[PDB]
Amino acid sequence: RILGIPWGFLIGAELTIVQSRISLVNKIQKVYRSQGVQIHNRHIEIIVRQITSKVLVSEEGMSNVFLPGELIGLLRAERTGRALEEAICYRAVLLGITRASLNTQSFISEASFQETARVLAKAALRGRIDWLKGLKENVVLGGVIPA
């Protein structure tokens, strides 16, 4: 309401996601620290970066660019919100670990993790391309590891 449709979604996502990052880094590292099992924050922050990576397009975000319920990265959502007037709308989502996988574009990293038949069914209907990068999806193909 306060910032309107061109910016209110983008900065609302930003504020949600940064608040969430701060909260998750605190609540997670507080356990390890209170248990004395010290860890550097740079290891937690990659996971929290993945948990807070996406936003979802809401119903009022229905467009020919994005359909409702579609999950898109925060960078994608910010950049398209700057660029396009095509009724863009999105809200931040806290994708739990078991839903950050099974929403990781290399479909082999999804199928070899869990829900293998459902992943394969969707991806084959989608004709999806796993442009092979990352490690889990490369060791199955017996590759040199893109790392």
Binding site: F107, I108, A124, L125, G127, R128, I129, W131, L141, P146
Partner: peptide, 9 residues
Amino acid sequence: KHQQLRIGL
């Protein structure tokens, strides 16, 4: 290095 996998019906 470019390589890709396609699954399909």
